[PDB]
Structures are given as structure tokens and as C-alpha cells.
Amino acid sequence: ADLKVEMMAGGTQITPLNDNVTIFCNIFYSQPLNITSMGITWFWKSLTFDKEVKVFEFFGDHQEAFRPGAIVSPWRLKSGDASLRLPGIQLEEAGEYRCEVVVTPLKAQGTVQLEVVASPASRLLLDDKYMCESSGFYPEAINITWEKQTQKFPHPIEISEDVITGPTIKNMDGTFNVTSCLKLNQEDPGTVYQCVVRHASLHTPLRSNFTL
Numbered sequence: 388a389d390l391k392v393e394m395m396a397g398g399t400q401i402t403p404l405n406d407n408v409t410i411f412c413n414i415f416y417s418q419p420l421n422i423t424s425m426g427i428t429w430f431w432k433s434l435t436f437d438k439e440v441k442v443f444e445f446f447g448d449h450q451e452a453f454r455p456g457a458i459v460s461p462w463r464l465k466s467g468d469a470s471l472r473l474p475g476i477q478l479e480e481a482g483e484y485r486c487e488v489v490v491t492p493l494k495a496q497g498t499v500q501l502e503v504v505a506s507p508a509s510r511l512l513l514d515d516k517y518m519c520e521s522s523g524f525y526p527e528a529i530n531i532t533w534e535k536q537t538q539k540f541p542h543p544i545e546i547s548e549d550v551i552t553g554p555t556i557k558n559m560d561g562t563f564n565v566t567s568c569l570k571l572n573q574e575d576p577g578t579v580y581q582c583v584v585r586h587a588s589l590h591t592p593l594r595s596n597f598t599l
């Protein structure tokens with residue numbers, strides 16, 4: 388084609404909740420481009436609702452953002468960069484974004500999936516039974532385990548016996564919490580107990596420790 392659009396390689400963009408995101412869209416055109424007579428429109432739709440809405444409409448003479456703070460800048464366009472910036476991205480803004488460019492009579496488009504993730508914060512509730520509460524994470528998938536390091540065997544051992552993890556619960560802001568319980572008793576002195584939280588938003592597991 389004479390007119391093409393390239394989005395993020397692979398089709399998916401992941402971003403931390405509340406960060407300022409830039410969703411890529413680069414224009415390729417085989418003939419000289421009049422950026423003042425071109426049209427760029429960004430659309431959004433939830434991954435479960437086929438309802439699609441406009442996020443930003445650019446026309447050489449004028450521009451309109453439908454989601455506040457959203458911007459495609461004329462200066463980036465000079466290098467064919469039609470990327471959309473969304474300051475302070477929210478969980479509800481995850482889903483699929485379509486970039487559509489029109490250079491009459493041609494039209495080109497590209498789509499990308501935006502995934503917004505929130506990292507869990509974890510805390511121990513030690514006041515027989517000990518708890519570990521992880522909170523404010525998104526998506527719901529999470530793996531909570533417990534491990535222990537004793538003096539006699541100085542290496543982590545995962546505790547599978549006597550661990551009951553409660554249901555994942557919903558927060559009004561759209562994130563989730565989950566609490567895991569460790570039952571003890573018959574223990575050696577100086578053992579370090581650890582609640583280990585694994586989630587997609589985490590680059591490394593979150594570990595919270597305590598001794599008795």
C-alpha cells in the first residue's frame with residue numbers, strides 16, 4: 388500500500404496504572420505528505436464491549452480530545468509519529484486502541500491492546516495463625532505462597548502444609564485484595580517465615596518476613 392500504519396510490535400502494550408502512556412502509531416506514506424490536510428483518529432473499545440468511542444481526532448486545521456489530557460502532537464507528526472499520549476492512565480482505559488490515518492482517498496489503520504496493571508502492596512498481620520494481606524493489585528490472577536528458612540537447613544523451603552488462602556476480593560477502585568493464612572505451632576528457634584507474592588506487575592516477587 389502507498390499508505391501504512393505501524394503499531395507496537397506484537398500487538399500489546401503494558402503499562403502501570405496511573406503512568407503517562409504513549410501508544411505508538413507511525414505513519415508510512417510513499418508520496419510527499421501534506422500534514423495539514425491529513426486526518427488522524429484514535430478509537431477505544433473495552434475488550435468485552437464492542438462499543439467503540441473516539442479518543443482524539445486530529446485534522447490539520449483543528450484537534451479535539453474526547454478523553455481529557457489526551458494528545459497527538461503536530462510536532463511529532465513531522466516525523467510521521469501519530470502516537471497518542473494519555474496522562475495518568477486508569478484501569479478502565481485498558482482495552483483496544485485503533486489508530487486510523489486518512490490521506491484522501493487512502494486510509495490505513497492499526498490496532499493495539501493496552502493492558503493496565505497495578506502492583507500489590509503486601510503486609511503481615513501477626514496479631515498459631517499469621518496472615519499476609521496483598522492489596523490493590525490488577526489483574527486478579529495472583530500466586531501467594533509461604534516459605535521458611537530454618538537454622539538447620541539454611542535455604543528456603545516452601546510451606547504447603549497448613550496454608551489456607553482466602554478468596555480474592557473486590558475493591559471499589561477496580562483493583563483486588565487477597566489474604567493468605569499460615570498456621571504454625573513444634574518449631575525451631577530462629578526460623579524466618581516469609582509470605583511471597585507473585586504477580587504480573589512485579590519484576591521480582593514481593594517477600595515479607597517475620598520470626599517468632
Ligand SMILES: *[C@@H]1O[C@H](CO)[C@@H](O[C@@H]2O[C@H](CO)[C@@H](O)[C@H](O)[C@H]2NC(C)=O)[C@H](O)[C@H]1NC(C)=O
Nearest residue numbers: 508510520521522523556557558559563564565
Ligand atoms: C484492601 O486492602 C486495603 C489495604 O489494607 C484496604 O484499605 C485500607 O482500609 C482501611 C480500613 O478502612 C483504611 O483505614 C486504610 O486507609 C486503607 N489502606 C490504604 C492505605 O489503602 C481495603 O479496605 C481492602 N479492601 C477491601 C475490599 O476490604
Ligand SMILES: *[C@@H]1O[C@H](CO)[C@@H](O)[C@H](O)[C@H]1NC(C)=O
Nearest residue numbers: 405406407408473474475476
Ligand atoms: C505524568 O506527567 C505529569 C506532568 O503533568 C507528572 O506530574 C507525573 O508524575 C507523570 N507521571 C509519572 C508518575 O511519571
Ligand SMILES: *[C@@H]1O[C@H](CO)[C@@H](O)[C@H](O)[C@H]1NC(C)=O
Nearest residue numbers: 420421422423424425447448
Ligand atoms: C496542504 O493542505 C492545505 C489544506 O488543504 C493547503 O492549504 C496547502 O496548500 C497544502 N499544501 C500543499 C499541497 O502544498
Ligand SMILES: *[C@@H]1O[C@H](CO)[C@@H](O)[C@H](O)[C@H]1NC(C)=O
Nearest residue numbers: 536579581593594595596597
Ligand atoms: C525478606 O527476606 C528476603 C530474603 O532474605 C529479602 O530479600 C527481603 O528483602 C526481606 N523483606 C523485607 C521486607 O525485609
